[PDB]
Amino acid sequence: GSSGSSGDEDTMSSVKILYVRNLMLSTSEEMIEKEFNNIKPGAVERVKKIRDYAFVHFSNREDAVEAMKALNGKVLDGSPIEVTLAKPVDKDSSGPSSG
């Protein structure tokens, strides 16, 4: 078999988020979870519905990316829904340099 693991860190800051806009008030979370889940089973971390928007989290960026495009350009409940990578605000945490 193949080695398996090389042992290293490509991306220290791995963030996966999918923001949705133009969501029909009639549409429910289940619809958002199922639609996004259709891509991968047990992939959607959580689904937060909002007035006319919502956010979808994932376990790995890879999955989030797939579900992003796959849906990117879809019409749910008769409405053009969009999916992009949300950019959450944050600041480099301060800690002990030598630890």
From Swiss-Prot:
Domain RRM stretches: 16-88
Impact when changing residue 19 to A: Slightly reduced RNA binding
Tissue: Widely expressed with highest levels in brain, liver, pancreas, colon and spleen.
Location in the cell: Nucleus; Endoplasmic reticulum; Cytoplasm
Transmembrane regions listed in the UniProt entry: none
Subunit-structure text: Part of the apolipoprotein B mRNA editing complex with APOBEC1. Interacts with TNPO2; TNPO2 may be responsible for transport of A1CF into the nucleus. Interacts with SYNCRIP. Interacts with CELF2/CUGBP2. Interacts with RBM47.
Domain notes: The RRM domains are necessary but not sufficient for binding to APOB mRNA. Additional residues in the pre-RRM and C-terminal regions are required for RNA-binding and for complementing APOBEC1 activity.
Biological function: Essential component of the apolipoprotein B mRNA editing enzyme complex which is responsible for the postranscriptional editing of a CAA codon for Gln to a UAA codon for stop in APOB mRNA. Binds to APOB mRNA and is probably responsible for docking the catalytic subunit, APOBEC1, to the mRNA to allow it to deaminate its target cytosine. The complex also protects the edited APOB mRNA from nonsense-mediated decay.
Protein name per the record: APOBEC1 complementation factor
UniProt organism field: Homo sapiens
